[PDB]
Scaffold this active site. Sequence first.
Site, PDB file in Angstrom:
ATOM      1  N   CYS A  69      -2.349  -0.093   3.545  1.00 56.13           N
ATOM      2  CA  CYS A  69      -3.416  -1.448   3.304  1.00 56.13           C
ATOM      3  C   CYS A  69      -3.050  -2.758   3.240  1.00 56.13           C
ATOM      4  O   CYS A  69      -2.238  -2.914   2.611  1.00 56.13           O
ATOM      5  CB  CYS A  69      -4.359  -0.555   2.697  1.00 56.13           C
ATOM      6  SG  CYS A  69      -4.730   0.982   2.605  1.00 56.13           S
TER       7      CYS A  69
ATOM      8  N   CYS B 206       0.637  -1.680   0.053  1.00 59.99           N
ATOM      9  CA  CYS B 206      -0.114  -0.178  -0.501  1.00 59.99           C
ATOM     10  C   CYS B 206       0.782   1.148  -0.053  1.00 59.99           C
ATOM     11  O   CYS B 206       1.048   2.076   0.909  1.00 59.99           O
ATOM     12  CB  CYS B 206      -1.031   0.059   1.098  1.00 59.99           C
ATOM     13  SG  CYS B 206      -2.097   1.445   1.356  1.00 59.99           S
TER      14      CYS B 206
HETATM   15 FE   LIG Z   1      -2.794   1.645   2.843  1.00 62.15          FE
END
Ligand SMILES: [Fe+3]
Lengths: 211, 197
Positions: free
Chosen positions: B106, B101
């Site tokens: 994420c 991410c």
């Molecule tokens: Fe993230």
Amino acid sequence: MDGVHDLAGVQGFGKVPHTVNADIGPTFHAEWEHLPYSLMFAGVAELGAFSVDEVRYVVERMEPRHYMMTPYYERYVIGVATLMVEKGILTQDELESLAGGPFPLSRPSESEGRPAPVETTTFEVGQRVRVRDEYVPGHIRMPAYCRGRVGTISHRTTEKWPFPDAIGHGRNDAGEEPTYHVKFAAEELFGSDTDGGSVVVDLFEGYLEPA
Amino acid sequence: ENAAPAQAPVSDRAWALFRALDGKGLVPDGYVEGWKKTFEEDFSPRRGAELVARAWTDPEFRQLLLTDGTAAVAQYGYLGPQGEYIVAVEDTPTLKNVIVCSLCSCTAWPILGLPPTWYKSFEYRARVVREPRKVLSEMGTEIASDIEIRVYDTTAETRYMVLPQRPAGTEGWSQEQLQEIVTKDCLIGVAIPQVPT
Ligand SMILES: [Fe+3]
């Protein structure tokens, strides 16, 4: 927002501080580190005070030098605290009184955000698309390395979600749209200066146009 | 200048945030304690390992996992926050997948566990998108140039897991035995599963 958080492609960093399968320790390395995610969950799902997208944007809004010297979990302590003050739930005075010292927050937003785009296209697997050559000062889930670049659709989501550039500002007009896995060749994103093969970015429909 | 802002110790700031909200009755009883336990105990890469070992030994499951990951994960009951729409990406003799991410952190929490400090580092977020072969090499994983590396940047709601190739030397192993060699780093894509040497 073309902020320092948009790190992909930046050059000058050193080694990733890991070797594979090394011991990474406990999930939480200090007794407070579970609090930013848990209090974020409280804010989103129990209080309904903000969206997850607003949490990403408020961390993006940290002053750039402050972002760069702050450890991950602390950025979210600062972000959630900032949203609680902006939304009128907490005051900075009570946060600083309870903390016994300064608690600087993220900077105010300089953009009201934007609505989900009204004109979009429904793409299919295999189509070639270009990422819209647009600049958004508020929240956006398009890393700049793919702005204006061309790739191929490898997946269209079967679910749909609010447009981050809207919901990340608390707006009422985020609608819902699917996202697309867009596969880029490494050389399309970084010219000759990459050692990879391809990169797939998961892009909301409203960031894309036919190529 | 360009010095850091003066700040109270982060522990004092984090608990101040807790106490300010809790003392207004905005945090349900046991709420952060409950999520801390979930984060620590239930969200685990042992789950994605279970999923990989099943895919390795069951072609029908493999097919489902690669075409509808969400439905496959839900059969095990492992959908959750940061893991509601799942896509499993399959390694092949000419393709190595890796997840990042770049914009934050994420990760498919319920089946990979919360991301480790290194995955959230600016080093990994900046570099693996542009020079994944070097990054993996530095991390201990050599990827031959006869293999395409594909980096998936987790920029929206899809949450990914890598299905690594099954290594030779594991034929006829049990689910349990297979699970043991599929580590958190294999599911992120920076490691290849290893058979004891
Ligand atoms: Fe993230």
